[PDB]
Design a protein around this ligand. Structure first.
Ligand code: HEC
Ligand code: HEC
Ligand code: HEC
Ligand SMILES: C[C@H](CCC(=O)O)[C@H]1CC[C@H]2[C@@H]3CC[C@@H]4C[C@H](O)CC[C@]4(C)[C@H]3C[C@H](O)[C@]12C
Length: 71
C-alpha cells in the first residue's frame, strides 16, 4: 500500500509507514485498536498521542510545525 498524506489546511502532513514499522516494532501501538479510531482522528489526536505525543515520548520524530506540515 501507499503512504498517505493528511490534508491539513496549513500544509500537507506525510505519514511514512516504512519508518514507523521499523521504529515502532510494537505494531499494537497503532493496529488492532478498537473501533472508532478512523472516525476519531483529528487535530487533537495528531498534536497529541496520535502523532506528536509519541514522537515526544520516544524522543524521535518531528515535533515542530514545519517538520510535519509542508506545502
Ligand atoms: C502507527 C504509527 C503505525 C505503526 C506503529 C505501524 N503501522 Fe502499519 N499502518 C499504519 C497506517 C496509518 C497504515 C495505512 C497507511 C499507510 O501508510 O500504509 C498502515 C498500513 C499497514 C500495512 C499495509 C502496508 C502495505 O500494504 O504497504 C501493513 C501490512 C501494516 N500496516 C502492518 C504493520 C506492522 C506489521 C507493524 C509493526 C511492525 C506496523 N504496521 C506498525 C500505521 C502504523
Ligand atoms: C509511535 C506510537 C508513533 C506514532 C503514533 C506516530 N509516529 Fe511518527 N515516528 C515515530 C518514531 C519513533 C519516528 C522516528 C523514525 C526514524 O527512523 O527517524 C517517527 C518518524 C516520523 C517521521 C519521519 C520519518 C523519517 O523518514 O525520518 C514522520 C514524517 C512522522 N513520524 C510523522 C508522523 C505522523 C504524521 C503521525 C500521525 C499521523 C505519526 N508520525 C505517528 C513514532 C510514531
Ligand atoms: C506532526 C507530529 C505534527 C506536528 C509537529 C504539528 N502538527 Fe499540526 N497537524 C498534524 C496532523 C497530522 C494534522 C491533521 C489532523 C487531521 O485531521 O488529519 C494537523 C492539523 C493541524 C491544523 C488543523 C488543519 C486543518 O484542520 O485543516 C493546524 C492549524 C495545525 N496542525 C498547525 C500546526 C502548528 C502551528 C504546529 C506547531 C505548533 C503543528 N501543527 C505541529 C501534525 C502535526
Ligand atoms: C490509533 C493510532 C494510534 C493513536 C492512538 O492511540 O489513538 C493512530 C495513529 C495514526 C492514525 C491514522 C493516521 C492516518 C489516518 C487519518 C484519518 O483521519 C483516520 C484514519 C488514519 C488511518 C488514522 C487511524 C488511527 O487513528 C491511527 C493509526
Amino acid at each position: 500500500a501507499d503512504d498517505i498524506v493528511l490534508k491539513a489546511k496549513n500544509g500537507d502532513v506525510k505519514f511514512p509507514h516504512k519508518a514507523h514499522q521499523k521504529a515502532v516494532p510494537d505494531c499494537k501501538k497503532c493496529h488492532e485498536k478498537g473501533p472508532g479510531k478512523i472516525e476519531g482522528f483529528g487535530k487533537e489526536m495528531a498534536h497529541g498521542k496520535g502523532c506528536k505525543g509519541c514522537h515526544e515520548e520516544k524522543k524521535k520524530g518531528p515535533t515542530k510545525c514545519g517538520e510535519c506540515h509542508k506545502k
